[PDB]
Amino acid sequence: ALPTIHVVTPTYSRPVQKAELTRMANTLLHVPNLHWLVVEDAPRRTPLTARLLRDTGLNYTHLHVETPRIPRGTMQRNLALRWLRETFPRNSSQPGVVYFADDDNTYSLELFEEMRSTRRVSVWPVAFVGGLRYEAPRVNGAGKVVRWKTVFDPHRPFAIDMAGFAVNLRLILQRSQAYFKLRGVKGGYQESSLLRELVTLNDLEPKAANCTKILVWHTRTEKPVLVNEGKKGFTDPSVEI
Amino acid sequence: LPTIHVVTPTYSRPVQKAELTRMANTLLHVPNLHWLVVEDAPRRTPLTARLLRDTGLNYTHLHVETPRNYKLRIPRGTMQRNLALRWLRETFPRNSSQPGVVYFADDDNTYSLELFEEMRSTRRVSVWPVAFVGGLRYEAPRVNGAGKVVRWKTVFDPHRPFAIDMAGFAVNLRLILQRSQAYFKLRGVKGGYQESSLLRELVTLNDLEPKAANCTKILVWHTRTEKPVLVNEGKKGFTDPSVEI
Ligand SMILES: O=c1ccn([C@@H]2O[C@H](COP(=O)(O)OP(=O)(O)O)[C@@H](O)[C@H]2O)c(=O)[nH]1
Ligand SMILES: O=c1ccn([C@@H]2O[C@H](COP(=O)(O)OP(=O)(O)O)[C@@H](O)[C@H]2O)c(=O)[nH]1
Ligand SMILES: [Mn+2]
Numbered sequence: 139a140l141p142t143i144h145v146v147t148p149t150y151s152r153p154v155q156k157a158e159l160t161r162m163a164n165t166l167l168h169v170p171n172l173h174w175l176v177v178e179d180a181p182r183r184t185p186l187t188a189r190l191l192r193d194t195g196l197n198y199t200h201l202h203v204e205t206p207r208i209p210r211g212t213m214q215r216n217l218a219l220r221w222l223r224e225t226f227p228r229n230s231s232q233p234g235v236v237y238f239a240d241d242d243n244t245y246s247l248e249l250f251e252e253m254r255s256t257r258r259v260s261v262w263p264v265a266f267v268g269g270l271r272y273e274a275p276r277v278n279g280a281g282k283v284v285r286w287k288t289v290f291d292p293h294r295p296f297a298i299d300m301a302g303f304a305v306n307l308r309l310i311l312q313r314s315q316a317y318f319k320l321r322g323v324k325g326g327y328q329e330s331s332l333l334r335e336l337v338t339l340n341d342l343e344p345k346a347a348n349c350t351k352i353l354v355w356h357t358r359t360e361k362p363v364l365v366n367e368g369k370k371g372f373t374d375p376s377v378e379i
Numbered sequence: 380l381p382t383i384h385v386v387t388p389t390y391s392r393p394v395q396k397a398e399l400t401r402m403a404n405t406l407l408h409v410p411n412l413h414w415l416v417v418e419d420a421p422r423r424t425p426l427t428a429r430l431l432r433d434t435g436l437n438y439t440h441l442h443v444e445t446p447r448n449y450k451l452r453i454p455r456g457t458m459q460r461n462l463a464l465r466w467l468r469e470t471f472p473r474n475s476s477q478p479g480v481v482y483f484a485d486d487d488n489t490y491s492l493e494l495f496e497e498m499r500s501t502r503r504v505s506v507w508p509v510a511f512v513g514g515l516r517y518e519a520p521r522v523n524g525a526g527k528v529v530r531w532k533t534v535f536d537p538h539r540p541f542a543i544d545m546a547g548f549a550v551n552l553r554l555i556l557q558r559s560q561a562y563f564k565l566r567g568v569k570g571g572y573q574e575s576s577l578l579r580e581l582v583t584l585n586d587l588e589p590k591a592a593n594c595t596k597i598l599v600w601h602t603r604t605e606k607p608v609l610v611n612e613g614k615k616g617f618t619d620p621s622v623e624i
C-alpha cells in the first residue's frame with residue numbers, strides 16, 4: 139500500500155561520478171518502496187553505472203540519452219517522464235510519487251517520508267540555492283502556500299529548486315504532454331515550466347513542518363585536481379574510480 | 380565482529396549538517412560501528428548533539444577547540460584526532476584484549492560499505508587505494524608477490540615512510556593502546572607527512588596489511604564540498620538565522 143517513490147536522477151561521466159552515486163545509493167538503500175530511475179547523459183549505458191546499480195540490489199531502471207543554454211539534466215529528466223508514461227497507464231492503480239533528485243545533492247531520510255504521502259504536488263525548503271542559506275515556500279497560518287521566500291525572481295510561478303518538490307505520479311500520467319522546457323528557458327524558470335502545467339499554487343502541499351525545516355541540501359562537489367597524472371597519465375586507466 | 384571506531388573531526392560551517400547527514404546515512408549500514416565525533420569547538424553544539432542522537436548510531440560525542448591562534452603548519456582536525464586517540468587510551472585498558480579497529484574518517488570523504496568490511500579484520504595496520512589525493516585519480520600502496528607492501532604508487536614524495544592519505548589506513552585498537560605515546564604531529568609537519576608521523580611509531584612497512592583486492596580497487600574517495608554562495612543574504616541577512624541548516 140505504501141506509495142512507490144520514483145527517484146529521477148540524471149547523471150554523467152566525470153571523475154567524482156562513482157563517489158556521488160555511491161553515497162546517494164547508501165542513502166536510498168534506507169528507503170522502502172523506492173524505484174531509482176537513473177538516466178545517463180551519454181550515447182549509451184556505461185558499465186560503471188550498470189555495475190554499481192546492479193550491486194546495490196536496489197530496484198532501478200537504467201536509461202540513457204545524450205545532450206546534443208538548457209539546464210543540466212533536462213533531456214534526461216524528460217526521458218524519465220516519457221518512460222513513466224509509457225510504463226504506467228493514465229488511470230492506473232499503482233500509487234506513486236515522482237521526485238527529481240540530482241546526483242550531487244544531500245538528502246535526509248525524513249525527506250522521503252515527507253514526500254511519500256504527496257496527493258498532488260508537495261514542496262519544502264531547499265538549502266544552498268538562490269544565493270541563500272535556503273529558499274522556502276511561504277505558507278500562511280492555514281497551511282497554504284501563498285508565495286516564495288527567495289531573493290532571485292521571487293515572483294516566478296514556482297520559485298523553487300528541482301530538489302524542493304515531488305509530484306503524485308497520477309498527475310504526471312494525466313498531463314501526458316507536460317515536459318521540462320528546453321527551448322525558451324528563462325533563468326530559473328524550468329521548474330515552473332513543468333509545475334505550471336500540473337498544479338496551482340493553492341493546491342501545493344507544504345512539507346517539513348509547514349516549510350520551517352531543511353531536509354535537503356543543494357551541495358556541490360569540488361572538481362578533483364589531477365595535475366600529477368601529466369599528459370601521459372600516471373595511474374592505471376583500467377582501474378575504475 | 381570487531382568494533383570499528385570511526386574518528387571524525389568536524390567543525391561548524393554551512394555544509395556541516397549536510398556532510399554529517401550523508402555520512403551518517405552510510406555509517407548506519409555498518410554493524411558494530413562506534414562513531415567518535417570530535418567537534419572543533421569550545422563546547423558540544425546543539426546541532427551535532429541532536430543529529431547524533433537522532434541517527435540511532437552508537438556514538439561518543441567529544442570536543443576540543445583548536446586554538447584560534449593555531450588557525451591563523453597544523454593540519455586540519457589534528458587536535459581532534461589526537462583527542463580521540465587519548466580518549467581511546469583512557470577508556471580501554473592497555474591489555475583490553477577487546478577486538479577493535481580505529482579509522483580516521485574526515486566528514487567530507489565518500490565511503491563505500493565494502494571499505495568497512497575490508498578494514499574490520501585489521502591485525503596491525505591495513506592500507507588501501509584512495510581516490511582524489513596527491514593530484515592523482517588515486518594513490519595506491521604497491522605490493523610484492525609475497526603480499527607485503529613494498530612502496531607507494533604516488534607522484535608526490537612516493538619515498539616517504541608512508542605515502543598515504545588519512546582515509547587510506549586503519550589501525551588495530553590494541554596497537555593504539557600498546558603504543559600509548561603515539562599521536563599525530565601537531566605542528567612543523569612537512570606537507571603530506573602527518574600520516575607517517577603516527578604510522579612510523581606504530582608499524583613497519585613489512586607489517587602492513589594490503590586490502591581492497593590487494594590494493595587494486597578504489598573503495599573510498601577524497602571528495603571535497605564546494606562552499607555555498609550566500610551573496611543574496613546581504614549584510615543584514617535574509618533568511619532566519621534560527622532555522623538550522
Ligand atoms: O552534462 C551534464 C551536467 C550535469 N548532469 C546531471 O544533471 C544534474 C544537474 O546538476 P549539476 O550541474 O550539479 O547541477 P547544479 O548543482 O550545477 O545546478 C545532476 O544530476 C548531474 O549529474 C548531466 O546529466 N549532464
Ligand atoms: O578548522 C577546521 C577545518 C577542518 N576540520 C575537520 O578536519 C578534517 C579536515 O578536512 P578538510 O579540510 O576537508 O580537509 P581536506 O580535504 O582539505 O584535506 C574534516 O573532517 C573537517 O571537518 C576541523 O575539525 N576544523
Ligand atoms: Mn547539483
Ligand SMILES: [Mn+2]
Nearest residue numbers: 485487488602
Ligand atoms: Mn576533506
